[PDB]
From Swiss-Prot, chains A, B:
Species this protein is from: Streptomyces venezuelae
Residue ranges of the region described as Thioesterase: 69-270
Reported function: Involved in the biosynthesis of 12- and 14-membered ring macrolactone antibiotics such as methymycin and neomethymycin, and pikromycin and narbomycin, respectively. Component of the pikromycin PKS which catalyzes the biosynthesis of both precursors 10-deoxymethynolide (12-membered ring macrolactone) and narbonolide (14-membered ring macrolactone).
Active site residues of this protein: 134, 254
Domain of life per record: Bacteria
Outcome when changing residue 177 to E: 10-fold reduction in the kcat/Km for ketoester
Protein name: Pikromycin polyketide synthase component PikAIV
Note: Type I modular polyketide synthases (PKSs) catalyze the step-wise condensation of simple carboxylic acid derivatives. Organizationally, type I PKSs are arranged into modules, wherein each module is comprised of a set of catalytic activities that is responsible for a single elongation of the polyketide chain and the appropriate reductive processing of the beta-keto functionality. A minimal elongation module contains an acyl transferase (AT) domain, an acyl-carrier protein (ACP) domain, and a ketosynthase (KS) domain.
Assembly description: Homodimer. Pikromycin PKS consists of a combination of multimodular (PikAI and PikAII) and monomodular (PikAIII and PikAIV) polypeptides each coding for a functional synthase subunit which participates in 1 (monomodular) or 2 (multimodular) of the six FAS-like elongation steps required for formation of the polyketide. Module 1, 2, 3, 4, 5, and 6 participating in biosynthesis steps 1, 2, 3, 4, 5, and 6, respectively.
Binding site for substrate: 67, 135, 162
Record text about domains: Cells lacking the TE domain are unable to produce methymycin, neomethymycin, narbomycin and pikromycin.
Span covered, complete protein: 1057 to 1339 of 1346
């Protein structure tokens, strides 16, 4: 399709994923934006992917879509099947990826607020537990902090699946070629240039300094196999979070933990949710 | 057309032409390149646009295509008609703008060597006078120096039409909006994203330090009208070259000197050529 995808393919071929993500971030400043949560063009209505049991007061799980330009509403499909008959699971879209092409958020807080309003409509009064994978894990925690402080609705918990926060990103930078190759392997259609610009823009959002820590307890779910090669002498390659409530290790790598081994992730989540309520 | 064009249009509207030319330069690093003049994909066969009188040892004019993404083989068409029955006029393409998409040069010297070899073939035994406008004027001079220094064959002269070399570009920045608007106004079809990356790549080449100075005599041709508003207390808005052999002023501004007033440009060239030989 478009030139950004062709350039990005070349960048991954030449092992320069990070350099090209910076180009996408810079280019993204020239796309139409939205600066107030109200100015948002898309409907961020969460999609119900699994139903809980017929009852009460139980937490609903909200999946926070990650930044992958090849992603979208299919991200949590495999995982959600293990929640059927256990928990409601809602998937909330990320602003800037839809349709027409969606406006990009002016800053992260503008996108988080538009998500927070959509989640509060769909969840009604049930307690909310957020879940995210990789960059979606970072976004789930930033959203949890936004719901606390700007919307007076603190979530009951956060599930961070393989997060690599600023200061602990080194292994995911070393494996950046595998991230890029996984984006192309995961194409169900050619990544549009609009979505690659969204991906670059959110990546830069989530690299910045964001000191707030949510008060909600954190479940840290970690892959057990490394995504690529790794020298023992470089230390621990694993995902990381500061002071998690619970830590769970599941089979698979950064990618296959949410595919072939998604049931192991679901079981860690379900046990944790029962414990904390 | 493509996303780069739409981004560029937005950048011009927001008075950010220069910042977006930098995004194009950075992005252009991920296009396939050629590193040897042999490895150049397209053939740089110079096109004969006007023929001189049939007789000897008269110089032929070589038009050095400029950097504008909206340019190409039409650039010298109205200028060349005034050379018919006076001087051979050849237009040499600029590598990376053609065709399958054209390979970009690894550095400016690589592209200049490719042009140098096509020109030496096409000109045969005739002395050569190089001519260029705006960014093409900077390229004409760099080509003149390459021919003298690396190929041992200095041209008989250089015609620089409205050059703004590094160190003398304050008007080019003050008028950046008008330059961007003149690019879109000059479109005969939509600027392709490949040509926009070519333009950004050559613009960065021409911003870098290039110390070599040609020993060929220079005709400096300047526009007489300012392209935009300019407080004369700043200094001179006009085009500049150090130690020109001759200076000629022609009607029109930076753009209209070459369309509406090309005959005035041609007449200054033809009179200068007779003088130096």
């Amino acid at each position: 399709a478009g030139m950004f995808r062709a350039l990005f393919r070349q960048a991954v071929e030449d092992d320069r994923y990070g350099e090209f993500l910076d180009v996408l971030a810079e280019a993204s400043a020239f796309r139409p934006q939205f600066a107030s949560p109200e100015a948002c063009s898309e409907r961020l209505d969460p999609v119900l992917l699994a139903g809980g049991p017929t009852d009460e007061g139980r937490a609903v799980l909200v999946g926070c879509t990650g930044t992958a330009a090849n992603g979208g509403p299919h991200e949590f499909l495999r995982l959600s099947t293990s929640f059927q008959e256990e928990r409601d699971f809602l998937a909330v879209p990320l602003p800037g990826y839809g349709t027409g092409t969606a406006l990009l958020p002016a800053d992260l807080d503008t996108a988080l607020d538009a998500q927070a309003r959509a989640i509060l409509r769909a969840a009604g009064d049930a307690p909310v537990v957020l879940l995210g994978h990789s960059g979606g894990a970072l976004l789930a925690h930033e959203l949890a902090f936004r719901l606390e402080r700007a919307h007076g609705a603190p979530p009951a918990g956060i599930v961070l699946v393989d997060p690599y926060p600023p200061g602990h990103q080194e292994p995911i930078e070393v494996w950046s070629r595998q991230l890029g190759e996984g984006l192309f392997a995961g194409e169900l259609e050619p990544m549009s240039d609009a979505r690659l610009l969204a991906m670059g823009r959110y990546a830069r959002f989530l690299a910045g300094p964001r000191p707030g820590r949510s008060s909600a307890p954190v479940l840290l779910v970690r892959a057990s196999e490394p995504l690529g090669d790794w020298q023992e002498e470089r230390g621990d390659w694993r995902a990381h979070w500061d002071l998690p409530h619970t830590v769970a290790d599941v089979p698979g790598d950064h990618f296959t933990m949410m595919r072939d081994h998604a049931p192991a992730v679901a079981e860690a989540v379900l046990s944790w949710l029962d414990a904390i309520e």
